[PDB]
Design an enzyme around this catalytic site. Structure first.
Site, mmCIF file in Angstrom:
data_model
loop_
_atom_site.group_PDB
_atom_site.id
_atom_site.type_symbol
_atom_site.label_atom_id
_atom_site.label_comp_id
_atom_site.label_asym_id
_atom_site.label_seq_id
_atom_site.Cartn_x
_atom_site.Cartn_y
_atom_site.Cartn_z
ATOM 1 N N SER A 118 0.872 -1.222 0.000
ATOM 2 C CA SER A 118 0.000 0.000 0.000
ATOM 3 C C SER A 118 0.883 1.238 0.000
ATOM 4 C CB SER A 118 -1.031 -0.038 1.144
ATOM 5 O OG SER A 118 -2.129 0.804 0.844
ATOM 6 N N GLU A 148 -9.233 -5.750 -3.459
ATOM 7 C CA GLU A 148 -8.666 -4.542 -2.814
ATOM 8 C C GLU A 148 -9.692 -3.548 -2.197
ATOM 9 O OE1 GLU A 148 -5.660 -4.063 -2.315
ATOM 10 O OE2 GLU A 148 -4.512 -5.271 -3.721
ATOM 11 N N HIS A 204 -7.733 -6.336 0.844
ATOM 12 C CA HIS A 204 -6.519 -5.509 0.891
ATOM 13 C C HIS A 204 -5.766 -5.751 2.204
ATOM 14 C CE1 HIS A 204 -4.091 -1.894 0.327
ATOM 15 N NE2 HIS A 204 -4.274 -1.654 1.621
#
Ligand SMILES: *[C@@H]1O[C@H](CO)[C@@H](O[C@@H]2O[C@H](CO)[C@@H](O)[C@H](O)[C@H]2NC(C)=O)[C@H](O)[C@H]1NC(C)=O
Ligand SMILES: *[C@@H]1O[C@H](CO)[C@@H](O[C@@H]2O[C@H](CO)[C@@H](O)[C@H](O)[C@H]2NC(C)=O)[C@H](O)[C@H]1NC(C)=O
Ligand SMILES: *[C@@H]1O[C@H](CO)[C@@H](O[C@@H]2O[C@H](CO)[C@@H](O)[C@H](O)[C@H]2NC(C)=O)[C@H](O)[C@H]1NC(C)=O
Ligand SMILES: CC(=O)N[C@@H]1[C@@H](O)[C@H](O)[C@@H](CO)O[C@H]1O
Ligand SMILES: CC(=O)N[C@@H]1[C@@H](O)[C@H](O)[C@@H](CO)O[C@H]1O
Ligand SMILES: CC(=O)N[C@@H]1[C@@H](O)[C@H](O)[C@@H](CO)O[C@H]1O
Ligand SMILES: CC(=O)N[C@@H]1[C@@H](O)[C@H](O)[C@@H](CO)O[C@H]1O
Ligand SMILES: CC(=O)N[C@@H]1[C@@H](O)[C@H](O)[C@@H](CO)O[C@H]1O
Ligand SMILES: CC(=O)N[C@@H]1[C@@H](O)[C@H](O)[C@@H](CO)O[C@H]1O
Ligand SMILES: CC(=O)N[C@@H]1[C@@H](O)[C@H](O)[C@@H](CO)O[C@H]1O
Ligand SMILES: CC(=O)N[C@@H]1[C@@H](O)[C@H](O)[C@@H](CO)O[C@H]1O
Ligand SMILES: CC(=O)N[C@@H]1[C@@H](O)[C@H](O)[C@@H](CO)O[C@H]1O
Ligand SMILES: CC(=O)N[C@@H]1[C@@H](O)[C@H](O)[C@@H](CO)O[C@H]1O
Ligand SMILES: CC(=O)N[C@@H]1[C@@H](O)[C@H](O)[C@@H](CO)O[C@H]1O
Ligand SMILES: CC(=O)N[C@@H]1[C@@H](O)[C@H](O)[C@@H](CO)O[C@H]1O
Ligand SMILES: *[C@@H]1O[C@H](CO)[C@@H](O)[C@H](O)[C@H]1NC(C)=O
Ligand SMILES: *[C@@H]1O[C@H](CO)[C@@H](O)[C@H](O)[C@H]1NC(C)=O
Ligand SMILES: *[C@@H]1O[C@H](CO)[C@@H](O)[C@H](O)[C@H]1NC(C)=O
Ligand SMILES: *[C@@H]1O[C@H](CO)[C@@H](O)[C@H](O)[C@H]1NC(C)=O
Ligand SMILES: *[C@@H]1O[C@H](CO)[C@@H](O)[C@H](O)[C@H]1NC(C)=O
Ligand SMILES: *[C@@H]1O[C@H](CO)[C@@H](O)[C@H](O)[C@H]1NC(C)=O
Ligand SMILES: C[C@@H]1O[C@@H](O)[C@@H](O)[C@H](O)[C@@H]1O
Ligand SMILES: C[C@@H]1O[C@@H](O)[C@@H](O)[C@H](O)[C@@H]1O
Ligand SMILES: C[C@@H]1O[C@@H](O)[C@@H](O)[C@H](O)[C@@H]1O
Ligand SMILES: C[C@@H]1O[C@@H](O)[C@@H](O)[C@H](O)[C@@H]1O
Ligand SMILES: C[C@@H]1O[C@@H](O)[C@@H](O)[C@H](O)[C@@H]1O
Ligand SMILES: C[C@@H]1O[C@@H](O)[C@@H](O)[C@H](O)[C@@H]1O
Ligand SMILES: [Ca+2]
Ligand SMILES: [Ca+2]
Ligand SMILES: [Ca+2]
Ligand SMILES: [Cl-]
Ligand SMILES: [Cl-]
Ligand SMILES: [Cl-]
Ligand SMILES: [Cl-]
Ligand SMILES: [Cl-]
Ligand SMILES: [Cl-]
Ligand SMILES: [K+]
Ligand SMILES: [K+]
Ligand code: NA
Ligand code: NA
Ligand code: NA
EC number: 3.1.1.8
Lengths: 527, 527, 527
Positions: free
Chosen positions: A196, A323, A436
């Site tokens: 990320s 995600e 995610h």
């Protein structure tokens, strides 16, 4: 008793038992002057040096940050909250080395995510002991400043120049260059990996001239700097710094006076006001993040990417199948982690408002049009799934794929993965799918621990990922060569092969999200 | 009187007459502290240095080792037994230089085979005087430790870290780097050559970072490290070290205590127990051999080969037409060097038990199936020939070919030979064909000696091999360019051209043992 | 008064007027200790150094040598005889530089031919003043030892190691490396050029490791070391040295004693006996020439050429249309420079005996067969022309073409010319055509002198050659770019383009002497 002489002095580690073997952990080694008083908002300054033995036997302070309080008592959100005291005194790093001490081991350096507003290296799912044990690599991870304390920018002004936390990361890479051989590491074989915002950091080190000689190659898990949350413009950054001043009572005429006043505020007053420096946020808002500072970043990063101005080396890039879903329960109407979240067309519409607050009506109708041409059954979950896909494709998957095409067009080998396994232990509900952040525990080898309630299939999947990440770091090629594994092809523009990571069968596929990314990449930017 | 000043002091050689010319031989130069007392089982330590003149006028002690006693009085086995006193004091090397002293001669460094359990540099068939005479190269050969004294491993423990004899070989290469110019040698033009375990050593120096700058190119005669006898796993190696301790009365709780006790044993007690550290052996058993030590060898060698992690340079690789036959008379039932060894199907079956002791019934039936589909006559020698081919293909020929494909896939030139001439003087019987080890006397140019009962055709064949090996060492290209010889093509995956070496006509052929190697390389490993 | 400070001291030159401009000539600069007394037959030794000013205002002594006395009073032979005193004291060189002194001029270094038995740098047709004037390059030329004094070999014995004159040439290249910048030269842009034995020398410097860093590129006019007169075998060389000893009364048992005795002989006694060291000579005999000495030449040169072991750089190579004709009047029966030399079949046959004295009857019939299949008229000059072509093709043209194919197969650019203009002033008769040696005056620009009785067409041809040689030296590409000249293509094996040099029209042609060279190159060597 294991004591290592570093450039700045002696450090003592601790021995851990891991799968019938030993790892030496040096936790909480400092790598910069604590950034306090007149040093708040400035670039990290180099470490003085100590005599006597520094004890690196516990995780250090995490950097000041706001905490996620949306689900108190819930392990799915709370596992991402800091698990050490918060303090401006937080520039420390961790080293895990195999036992016995290796001779010239590859080094993997982890950079955590959290939006550039949150995060810490001491989280359980970033524990490097398993990798050091099993692959005999050395793992390093650092705390870096986040939020305004790490990214406040009055561009060109060295009192608050911007990108301080990216310079924190850099100074930790420099520490590994000067010191890791003493720990049995090879400074010539360093791989950065991050997820990320950590992945977007790794991508910006590929772009920063001052980072070029501090590492060998790069791994980007669900993140890259061309993601729309990853870089703040000069204009929004000055505006944010000034809004922060308005709210804290620090508006002045002289800019250096503004910063001087900001340095007298308690960290809490600064943290409390961060959310409001912006007129509307979304759950992906990055209020204070990387900027083009003329120092770390010499020009707009999309220009550097396009014109081939970055370190030439192999990359490994990837994304998770769902995600966008984790974000829907931080503000989209009709979503709940505690039910199945079947939403209407009207709710989908309002959700776009939550996620695309500055966008014209036409911009939002164009999203609805691209994503709601159903195939075709009158399935009730249509709108719920479409919103997750909207949010994952725009924010993570299409930017990752586009970074990967552009980078590999200049001649270097690239490998792309699509992670599609939902952890048997995920505390989040089933509709959220392969979320995610939930590959990370596979990369760090947590399911290698049998005591730990993962299935057999999961242990085997993690073991194979760990070997592919390690082979990538050591050799530039993420193959698992001994167990008749699917051979992982390089990603080229044109064919665009990628590898799926799953528990059943591992596949080579082509052109991930081709129709969706054409939308986000060639049309949406015009809107 | 020919005296050379080395880094560690003066050495005196002796002059030999060879084909109407002179060679200077320096035999028994030391290259390490003798590895005795507290140095047993440790890496070789560098040489102190002497004053006065060291006399290198005789072969030194061979390293401690068990001897072949299967055929007492028989020259075919006995020519491979050591012909100098055995002693732990055995780290010496030999140098043969042309006379007059050359100016910048290529250097060929010989590494003997013997299973990593036996062997010595002083054998008659490794005498370097003929090569130095005729090709004007300098030839060097070294003794290196073998058996437990050379390869005992408690991995990670520097009291017995493993691979000591491979480090002995390395330290001798370093000696040539620092000293060979004084003898008229070019340290920049060094070729390693070796046969069997010596060839597997050469292949591991291609893989060892610490050897990369100690030589230029490599020649592998019937051996490579991916052969199934060539590398011991950590697991079998610890197990063997501990079994050795059980048998010698040295089981202790502390591992360093085990080694301390092992250092008090007489070498004989150690040698006597080596055969039994394993539950069943075969005639190719390597009880104590190379391991992945994290030092010489940084990872499993099959991974390094596959992922291209090795020195980039040309190689010359080859095998003999009947590699496996010599081994059948060291335990397969129904074989004898003293008769024609026509065996039954039942004997063939029992022989597989001798050679594949840990393998499932299915594994062994699969060998019988692949090798006993006769073409088609009811020839009585069917089963006898099949067993020799089984043993040669699995142990030598298929591993050599596979090493050669994988190495040349990374861009370097490779040359492959198939030696098919049976020496007119071979004391072994005719059914054994072109045996393992019986090219060596051709490479060293023994049939160039007319006094010596080889035929004319054999003199000419040896002369041409010597020129091709020398041209390979000096120029990277094993051609014989003056006598309208068959031009030797590079081996590429895809075409896989190789050259046959024989007395009649030299041929370019393709895809040696294609059906057999598909069996050993793609199926058998799964079994 | 123009004085240059060299490494060994001051030298004074002289100013010349050349085409309305000035050139500075430094003639007779010494570059080695004179090779006298105990230095006869040894490698040249480096120059001591002088104080005061050395006067380089006249050509120095030419090296001892036999003289051509076949045509006393005839300018065609006599122009090649030495025009300075002969002396063992002859290691000097000449430098011509433009005026004003250039800043970093390319350097052309001339190496004369003469069979390695004769020659001198002071001949009129090697005067470098015209090139320096017109192309602004610096021209250097050296005397080097010839005959036994330059090439006597008892190989491996440093009292007479062989190749001394080639080492003389080398030591002069080293002088240019250390000294030419003082004269306004660029040591980094040096081109060697030479004709016949001088061209074979240039080709051997491409092969000698010790010459590699002493020059940039090479031009070979009618000569290369693979010509059959260019290199003596060790066997014939020892035999010649010993025959010389027999004839001078210097046979001894100790070889060093032989040389000691040889050093007491007057140079005349040595020169008088040179012709007889061989049982039969031809007009192209090279009694004492280059050998494989293990020093200048590390291996047989045909092996180095074939296996690509030589300096990688561009070459310019060429030959004259009638190379072989000059030699026919030095012994072939029926030839005379003073008549038309129409010879019979029987005379042609006897001529082959003169030129191929050691060759079998079959070898000679094969030459007659290849060269006497007439096309077809019964022209009386058939046998006369065939003999010239036999001698030119075997000795010059086919070896030049084969050198050029093999050299360019390793990737470097090569340019090949065929010179076909007969000088308007040639004193030799018309049947001799475009003779060996008669391009040289074009390369040196003599017809640029209008006073000098060349035609206009010849001035223009020379001017264009001079520009192509200069562009080759400076830029690696022998083009004349301003006057719509025929563009000179690189010579590749496969197409084999070459350029014709003539007064009428300059042409690109392919595969010079293709049928003849197939004969000399692939068949004749077997004979
Ligand atoms: C699942 O839970 C969500 C979260 O509460 C429910 O959403 C609410 O629905 C009401 C109608 O009762 C809206 O007016 C609320 O504002 C929503 N609340 C919030 C806090 O967003 C949703 O309806 C439930 N969906 C199910 C059971 O399918
Ligand atoms: C060749 O010699 C071998 C070696 O002895 C013979 O093998 C033996 O055959 C007997 C039957 O007499 C077996 O029971 C023995 O155990 C074998 N002996 C050993 C020591 O292996 C073989 O039969 C002979 N083959 C011939 C003559 O063709
Ligand atoms: C050209 O001149 C040559 C050279 O003399 C002549 O050759 C001689 O011919 C005679 C016959 O009178 C031979 O027996 C001689 O031995 C040759 N002499 C030598 C010295 O070689 C040749 O005949 C003349 N050719 C012509 C005029 O066409
Ligand atoms: C408190 C401190 O600064 N260092 C301590 C040291 O004094 C102690 O003896 C050691 C043993 O556990 O642990 C650490
Ligand atoms: C979004 C942007 O670019 N700037 C905002 C603007 O909306 C806001 O009203 C002003 C003061 O808060 O500055 C900030
Ligand atoms: C542009 C400007 O006004 N700069 C001043 C600076 O020189 C001074 O050091 C600072 C602290 O008092 O105040 C501000
Ligand atoms: C242009 C501008 O200054 N806009 C903002 C406005 O958006 C906001 O509502 C207000 C704070 O309540 O401050 C002001
Ligand atoms: C025994 C020893 O150490 N060195 C000897 C030396 O003394 C002897 O003079 C020489 C002559 O053969 O041989 C060697
Ligand atoms: C083959 C292997 O891997 N290990 C062997 C095992 O068979 C044996 O029984 C034990 C003690 O001898 O250890 C050893
Ligand atoms: C792990 C362990 O127990 N190591 C000890 C070591 O420190 C000591 O030097 C050796 C010799 O007595 O005995 C053992
Ligand atoms: C598992 C195990 O310990 N196995 C071995 C066994 O194979 C062997 O027969 C015995 C020695 O006779 O020692 C024990
Ligand atoms: C003879 C000698 O060694 N050097 C002479 C020098 O004395 C003289 O003055 C000069 C002028 O032409 O020419 C040169
Ligand atoms: C041609 C050759 O190779 N050697 C010659 C041989 O003919 C001659 O008879 C002998 C003595 O002159 O040595 C020389
Ligand atoms: C091999 C041989 O006999 N060499 C000798 C040499 O040592 C001596 O210097 C020379 C001069 O007298 O005579 C000769
Ligand atoms: C083999 C040999 O020694 N040959 C030569 C012979 O060719 C020659 O005729 C003679 C000198 O007249 O000397 C002798
Ligand atoms: C580690 O490996 C590098 C090359 O990757 C080498 O240059 C370095 O010196 C090595 N250091 C060791 C073995 O200590
Ligand atoms: C390879 O497979 C075996 C099981 O057959 C397993 O124990 C091991 O973990 C695997 N290794 C990797 C790197 O996946
Ligand atoms: C030997 O050859 C090498 C290049 O292969 C060169 O660099 C070296 O200096 C040479 N040494 C001699 C001629 O002594
Ligand atoms: C080349 O051939 C000749 C015989 O014609 C022989 O004497 C020589 O040994 C051969 N050389 C090589 C290198 O094979
Ligand atoms: C001459 O040219 C070279 C490159 O060919 C350069 O390196 C050198 O220093 C130059 N010297 C001068 C202009 O004096
Ligand atoms: C080019 O042509 C002119 C005549 O048109 C002539 O004067 C000159 O010499 C030529 N130059 C060369 C280099 O051939
Ligand atoms: C000071 C700033 O002013 C504007 C508002 O929209 C922001 O929320 C912030 O409060
Ligand atoms: C699960 C949902 O969570 C939220 C609340 O507003 C609703 O009452 C509902 O219970
Ligand atoms: C100590 C070891 O124990 C087990 C046996 O199978 C071996 O032969 C060895 O003796
Ligand atoms: C040649 C064979 O050798 C073995 C013996 O067991 C047999 O008797 C036979 O003589
Ligand atoms: C000494 C030599 O002996 C032989 C002769 O053929 C040569 O001409 C020479 O004279
Ligand atoms: C030109 C020729 O030269 C020679 C002589 O042998 C002949 O007489 C003839 O004159
Ligand atoms: Ca979890
Ligand atoms: Ca033998
Ligand atoms: Ca002339
Ligand atoms: Cl609508
Ligand atoms: Cl496709
Ligand atoms: Cl059966
Ligand atoms: Cl084929
Ligand atoms: Cl005839
Ligand atoms: Cl053509
Ligand atoms: K099978
Ligand atoms: K023929
Ligand atoms: Na909490
Ligand atoms: Na014996
Ligand atoms: Na004369």
């Amino acid at each position: 008793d294991i004591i290592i002489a570093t450039k700045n002095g002696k450090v003592r580690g601790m021995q851990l038992t891991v799968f019938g073997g030993t790892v030496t952990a040096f936790l909480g080694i400092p790598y910069a002057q604590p950034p306090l008083g007149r040093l708040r908002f400035k670039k990290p300054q180099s470490l003085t040096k100590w005599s006597d033995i520094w004890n690196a036997t516990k995780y250090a302070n995490s950097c000041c940050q706001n905490i996620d309080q949306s689900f108190p008592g819930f392990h799915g959100s709370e596992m991402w909250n800091p698990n050490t005291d918060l303090s401006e005194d937080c520039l420390y790093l961790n080293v895990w080395i195999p036992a016995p001490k290796p001779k010239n081991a590859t080094v993997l350096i982890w950079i955590y995510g959290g939006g550039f507003q949150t995060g810490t290296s001491s989280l359980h799912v970033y524990d490097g002991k398993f990798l050091a044990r099993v692959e005999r690599v050395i793992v390093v991870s650092m705390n870096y400043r986040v939020g305004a304390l790490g990214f406040l920018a009055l561009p060109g002004n060295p009192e608050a120049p911007g990108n301080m936390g990216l310079f924190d990361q850099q100074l930790a890479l420099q520490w590994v260059q000067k010191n890791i051989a003493a720990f049995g590491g090879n400074p010539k074989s360093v791989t950065l990996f991050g997820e990320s915002a950590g992945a977007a950091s790794v991508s910006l080190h590929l772009l920063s001239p001052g980072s070029h000689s501090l590492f060998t190659r790069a791994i980007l898990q669900s993140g890259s700097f061309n993601a729309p949350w990853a870089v703040t413009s000069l204009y929004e950054a000055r505006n944010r710094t000034l809004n922060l001043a308005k709210l804290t009572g620090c508006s002045r005429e002289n800019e250096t006076e503004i910063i001087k006043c900001l340095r007298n505020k308690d960290p809490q007053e600064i943290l409390l006001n961060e959310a409001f420096v912006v007129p509307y946020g979304t759950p992906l808002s990055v209020n204070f993040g990387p900027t083009v500072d003329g120092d770390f970043l010499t020009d707009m990063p999309d220009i550097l990417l396009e014109l081939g101005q970055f370190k030439k080396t192999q990359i490994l890039v990837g994304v998770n199948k769902d995600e966008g879903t984790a974000f829907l329960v931080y503000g989209a109407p009709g979503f709940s982690k505690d039910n199945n979240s079947i939403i209407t067309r009207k709710e989908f519409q309002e959700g776009l408002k939550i996620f695309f607050p500055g966008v014209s009506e036409f911009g939002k109708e164009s999203i609805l049009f691209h994503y709601t041409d159903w195939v075709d059954d009158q399935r009730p979950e249509n709108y719920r799934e479409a919103l997750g896909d909207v949010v994952g494709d725009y924010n993570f998957i299409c930017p990752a794929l586009e970074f990967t095409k552009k980078f590999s067009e200049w001649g270097n080998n690239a490998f792309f993965y699509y992670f599609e396994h939902r952890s048997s232990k995920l505390p989040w509900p089933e509709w959220m799918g392969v979320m995610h952040g939930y590959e990370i525990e596979f990369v760090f080898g947590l399911p290698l621990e049998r005591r730990d309630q993962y299935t057999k299939a999961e242990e085997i999947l993690s073991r194979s990922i760990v070997k592919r990440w390690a082979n990538f770091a050591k050799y530039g090629n993420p193959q698992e060569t001994q167990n008749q594994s699917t051979s992982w092809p390089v990603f080229k523009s044109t064919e665009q092969k990628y590898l799926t990571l799953n528990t059943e069968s591992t596949r080579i596929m082509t052109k991930l999200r081709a129709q969706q990314c054409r939308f986000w990449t060639s049309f949406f930017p015009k809107v």
